[PDB]
Design a binder for this molecule. Structure first.
Ligand SMILES: CC(C)OC(=O)C1=CN(C(=O)c2ccc(OCCCN3CCOCC3)cc2)CC(C)(C)c2c1[nH]c1cc(F)ccc21
Length: 216
């Protein structure tokens, strides 16, 4: 039980959960940019709240936010796909995303990942902690003090590992399976990079915020 957490870890989890919970053709794509813009704003507010984030150098703060935006977007998308989208609309979502321009070439691993995540049946607590862990990655491009980020990420990993034992005691490889998904998640940085290239070749245009956060 959550009695397994120290009061300090309990407080940290409560903080994270409270903040996590405070979150046609060419028109289709416009809808996706709008969704992405909206998520970015949510991601900034969650990011700012992470424990110790404020003790990080400002430039490192920014690089963590930029570095994690795509991984975070896909992790939140997996959550929506599994926890919010009726299974019966699954096909609709995919068909519409196809018709936005995005080719099934990279739509395929996207939905595979969503279903992969679904198979782990992650709790909201795991989604919240994974997101925080994604954001606090010490090995992001351009980070100056990786030690300090590693130091903020460590306690979150500890809490998540305890939560894995707690939610699936008889499945000891669960924590590792989650790390496994973090690997699969990271492949989307390249996928998205490919995507923005093509999009910008077809002159897709973007909001200034997305231009900044996605390096277009
Ligand atoms: C986190 C936000 C929502 O996701 C996004 O913005 C992206 C979401 N993608 C999703 O596959 C996705 C989108 C919507 C979803 O639910 C829509 C239905 C919401 N339920 C309906 C039932 O009642 C609960 C809410 C789930 C996954 C990935 C992808 C790559 C397509 C994409 C997103 N934006 C973009 C901006 C771009 F220019 C180019 C591509 C994207």
């Amino acid at each position: 039980s959550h009695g397994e957490l120290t009061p300090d870890q309990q407080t940290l989890l409560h903080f994270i959960m409270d903040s996590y919970n405070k979150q046609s053709a060419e028109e289709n794509f416009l809808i996706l940019t709008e969704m992405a813009t909206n998520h970015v704003q949510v991601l900034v507010e969650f990011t700012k709240k992470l424990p110790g984030f404020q003790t990080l150098d400002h430039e490192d703060q920014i690089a963590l936010l930029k570095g994690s935006a795509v991984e975070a977007m896909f992790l939140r998308s997996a959550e929506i796909f599994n926890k919010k989208l009726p299974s019966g609309h699954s096909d609709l979502l995919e068909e519409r995303i196809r018709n936005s321009g995005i080719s099934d070439e990279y739509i395929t691993p996207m939905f595979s990942f969503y279903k992969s995540i679904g198979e782990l049946k992650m709790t909201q607590e795991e989604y919240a902690l994974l997101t925080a862990i994604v954001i606090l990655s010490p090995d992001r491009q351009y980070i100056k003090d990786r030690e300090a980020v590693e130091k903020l990420q460590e306690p979150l990993l500890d809490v998540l590992q305890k939560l894995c034992k707690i939610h699936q005691p008889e499945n000891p490889q669960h924590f590792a399976c989650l790390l496994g998904r973090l690997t699969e998640l990271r492949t989307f940085n390249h996928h998205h990079a490919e995507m923005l290239m093509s999009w910008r070749v077809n002159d897709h245009k973007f909001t200034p915020l997305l231009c900044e956060i996605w390096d277009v």
